[PDB]
Structures are given as C-alpha cells and as structure tokens.
UniProtKB/TrEMBL annotation, chain B:
GO terms for biological process: endoplasmic reticulum to Golgi vesicle-mediated transport; Golgi vesicle transport; vesicle-mediated transport. One of its GO terms (cellular component) is TRAPPIII protein complex. May play a role in vesicular transport from endoplasmic reticulum to Golgi. This is Trafficking protein particle complex subunit 5. Signal peptide: none annotated. The keyword Endoplasmic reticulum applies. Keywords: Endoplasmic reticulum, ER-Golgi transport, Golgi apparatus, Transport. It is found in: Endoplasmic reticulum; Golgi apparatus, cis-Golgi network.
From TrEMBL, chain C:
It comes from the Eukaryota. This is FI18195p1. It comes from Drosophila melanogaster.
TrEMBL record, chain D:
It is found in: Endoplasmic reticulum; Golgi apparatus, cis-Golgi network. May play a role in vesicular transport from endoplasmic reticulum to Golgi. Gene3D superfamilies: Trafficking protein particle complex subunit 3. GO terms for cellular component: cis-Golgi network membrane; cytoplasm; cytosol; endoplasmic reticulum; Golgi apparatus; TRAPP complex; TRAPPII protein complex; TRAPPIII protein complex. Pfam families: TRAPP. Homodimer. Belongs to the TRAPP small subunits family. BET3 subfamily. InterPro entries: Bet3 (IPR016721), NO_sig/Golgi_transp_ligand-bd (IPR024096), TRAPP_component (IPR007194). This is Trafficking protein particle complex subunit. One of its GO terms (biological process) is endoplasmic reticulum to Golgi vesicle-mediated transport. Keywords: Endoplasmic reticulum, ER-Golgi transport, Golgi apparatus, Transport. It comes from Drosophila melanogaster. The gene is Bet3.
Amino acid sequence: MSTYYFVIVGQNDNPIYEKEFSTVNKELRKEDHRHLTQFIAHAALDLVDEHKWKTANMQLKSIDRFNQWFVSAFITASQIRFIIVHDNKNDEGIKNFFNEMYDTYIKNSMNAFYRINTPIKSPMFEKKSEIFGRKYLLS
Amino acid sequence: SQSIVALLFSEIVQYSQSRVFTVPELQTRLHDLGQDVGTRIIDLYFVRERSSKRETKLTQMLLFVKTTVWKNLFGKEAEKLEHANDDERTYYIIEKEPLVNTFISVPKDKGSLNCANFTAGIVEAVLTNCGFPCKVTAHWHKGTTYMVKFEDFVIARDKQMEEK
Amino acid sequence: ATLLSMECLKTARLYSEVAKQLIRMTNEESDLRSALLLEQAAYCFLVTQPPMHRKYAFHIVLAGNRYSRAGQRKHAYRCYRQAYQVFQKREWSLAEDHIQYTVAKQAYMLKQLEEASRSFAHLLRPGSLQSAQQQTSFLKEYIQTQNELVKRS
Amino acid sequence: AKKVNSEFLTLTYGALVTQMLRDFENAEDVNKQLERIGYNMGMRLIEDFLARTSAPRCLEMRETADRIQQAFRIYLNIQPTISNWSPASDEFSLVFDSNPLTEFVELPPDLTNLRYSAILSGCIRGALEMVQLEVQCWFVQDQLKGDNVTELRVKFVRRLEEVIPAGED
C-alpha cells in the first residue's frame, strides 16, 4: 500500500491545505511526517520550478525521493502545486484525479470569498476531498 | 445582457469613488478589482479555450490570452499585440475598443484613468498567475492600449528559454 | 572520489551534479560521517544557488543531533548556528519551533533562555494548533522565561 | 449575442461583495449599501425595460408582477413565477429559478445576516420607485440561505399618481 498524502503549495509559496489518504496508524509519528511533507512541499516547489520550465504540460510524474516516499507534483495554470507523497505510485489515475480536483478548485475560484492563496475553509471542498480520496487514493 | 453589467460595474467604480478621495488610488482600486476577477478568469478560460494547455512561450500565452479573454469578456479580441524591441520587458496590447467606453464614460477632465485600468488589472492578474508577473498600465495612447512591463527576472527566464 | 568530483566541478561552476551525488552519498556510511558529510553536501548544494535551503536545513539538524552525539564540538556547534541562521533567513517557525525546543534543552542548561522564549511566543499556541505535549512544552517555556524574568527582576 | 457571460458578471459581483465586506466588517452596512445600489440600478434599469415594452404604468398589480417578471428574463435570462396572492390580492410571491450572480458562490455562515442578492430585491424597489409605486419588497425564502428555489415577497404599499401621468410628487 501507499500512504497517500496531498498538500497544496500556494502562488506565494506558502502552504495552504492538506488531505491524508493513508491507512490509519502511526499518527503521532505522522505529525512529524506532516512537518516533513510540508518541507517536502517546499523542496518540490523548488525542483518543480525548473522542471516545469523544462516542460509545458500539467503533470510532472514524480521528482523527489527519500528512500521510502515518492513525491508526485501537479502544476496548474493557477501555478498552484498539488503534491502527493506515497510509498508506491498511483499516477495513471491521479492525472485526471488532479484534473477533477482542479475543476473543484475552479468551483472554489468562482466563489470570490475564496481568494489568492486564501486557506481552504469551505465544507464543500472538504467533502469533495473526502469522496475523491475514498474513490482512488484512500482505497 | 449589456446594460446590467455596464451599470453594475459603474456602481463598483463610483462606490470606490465614494470610498476614495482622489484619482490615482481610485484607479488603484479599479486595478485591484480587475485583479480579483482575473484571478479566476485565468483558470476558467484555461480549460474551455486553451484545451487545458500551458504556453511557456510569452508570445504564445500572451497572444492566446489576447484572443480568449477579449473573445469571451467583450466579444472582440483586441486588435494588436506588439513587442517593443528597445525594451524586451515592455510590450503593448492595443485594444481599439474601449471597454470603459462600451458604457460611454465620464469626462476625463476631473479624472484621467477608467475601467481601462480595471481590465488592465485583469490582464495583470492573468500574467502574474500564468507565471509571468508583470505591470499592466492602461494608456490613452493610440486610443486604448495596455502597456505590459515584464520583471527582469521573468523576461530573463524568457530570454534564457529563447536560447535554443 | 566524491571530494575530487566536488573540487573539479567547482572548477566548472556547475555544482548541481556533485551536489546531488554528495547528497546521495551522505545518507549512508555512518551516522557520524553521514552528519558532517550531510553538511558538506548541504552547503555545497547551496553553493550553486543561495536559496532552496529547505532540505539543507532539515538534514543538517537531523544530523546536528548526531553532531552532538559523536562530533568535535566546534564543528557541531557551527552546524547548530548556521542551521539556525538558515532557518531565520526564511523563517517558517513550525519545525523551527521543535528544533528550538532543542535549542531550549541546550538553553535550559547551557544556552540563553530568551531565544526559546520568543520562539515559542511567536508560535502562540492558540491559532497555531499546538498539541498536548506542545502545551506542556510551553509550560516549561514559561518556566524558563520565569527564570529569565526572575534574573532580570 | 448577450455580450456577457453569467460567470463574468458573477465574478464581478462576488468581487464587489468581497470588497464591501473588506470595507465594513458589519454586514448591516453592506446590506444597506447593496440595497442602496440596487435602488440606484433599478432607477436607470426601468429606463431600458420601458425602452422595449411601453406598458401602461399600472392598470393592476398583476401587470406589475408580470412586468418585473419579464424584466429578469430580459436581463438575467431567467423566468420567475408569480403566485401566492393574498385575499387582499395586492401582494404576491415571486420565484427566481437560477441566479447567475449566485452560481456556486458560497456564503460564510459567519456572514448569515447578509442578504447577498438583495440588489435585485432593491432593483425592483428602485424600479417600483420610478413608476411612482413604492413597494415593501423582500425575500421570504432564499436559495442562497439553503432554500430550494429563490422566493421574494412583494407587499405593495401605496400609489403616487393621479388621473394625470404627472402625479403627486
């Protein structure tokens, strides 16, 4: 299995919103791993900058490695970074799964209340995250 | 419709004029609102027109924005997109149709700038979220034009990419 | 071999490569040699470009522990100092807070208290989502800043 | 060609609402000024609604109801439904089906006292002002608030016109 974990990196590089998709265990250690993965979000940020300057497409398969984790990076026209840390990859579905969370994030965009890198608070997006994660990643 | 949007936007402008005691930062409010709309205009129009495809080439992304945003917002794509060779940071997008004067506007005696600044702020938000931060200024040069000033960092990344 | 790589690529300004192969070395061969090689590879990774100090910071403190463990004190101490300065450069006090709890454990005995006091003060438990051990930790921070206030008053 | 997108106007209005809430923390003032600008629009808007249909001012109140009803189809391209008249048969209820300004624009529950789209509820006010028929008009069920479909309640109060078009003023 893969301990899927999603994280948002904003336009101004500050993190925004996470969402676990892992099995239930080691949650106290998972707090330290959450600190770790925010740091990995910054490291991704840094690498995927030049790597997205290498390309012009939406998905950059997987960039960083830490001897157990895989880091999968998604870049948008919103230049947001959507990141998954996961022991074994599931990329083939998450390409369009990122596309669908992209569409939902657009839905939040039309909500002018949600604004530039303004941290997520709506229950709508949280329940969308729950249902989508139970769909593919958390499964 | 057109009257509803033209008016309602006019009340945005004049209510800002209420909260604002002078021309320039009134225009700044217009810019900020243009930003707050473009900040989603960008990635809406991404999927439905750009076919969810990113354009790293400043020319291609800028041209496609020129087509798309004007095609859907105000129907007619802006007439011309030009790059100034003296200053590669500073290009122009001339739109002969004034989107302010679509709703025929105030005498520019007591004031200078208008909804032109609002759509300029839209353009600026689109640029800065496309990974090309820029300064977009409405200018009454050859009618309505938007001067775009690229960050030396952004135009430098571009020039380095423009080393095939 | 990696050191000659380091120097010769430094004769090419393209330090990125040797940055990557030194960082892939330094994980292994020890927990001590891993540490000083972690900072070697780390500052070298930073030699090419000043920013992206992120994993720099992470592994250099996750090796500063080993530095306190089995290292000569001046090098381990320059570890701690340069790591912490790199933290403040681009602040992000979240994990810096726990590493400053470590700053406190070396300050509850040796270093100055006020740095840990202000570090936890900027974290400011409500609104920073601190945890049970973190509330107890800032109780202990109150104890240290009580020592400091008493010594000032 | 309708020369607009529902999303476009929705973005502009949502940004404006954001702007007021950033201006005044209290939703009371944002409601006040939003109804103020609804009055402001509704005064000029009737100048175009009567630029197409030259309906007589008010033979009866159901004429006013149908006029305001067709107004939104003219502008917002939505057909409201008129129903729920009193035994007095002066008031009525009006159903807005879909609101372009609303479309997936959530509201903060920490902001409930706001009446978001009451600009329309004021536009008719500003409209009803102009034809010399002031009206106590507001919502009884709000699709915004969590209700099924939007439902505004119109209580007409009094007239301002004599057997002459000039009327009292």
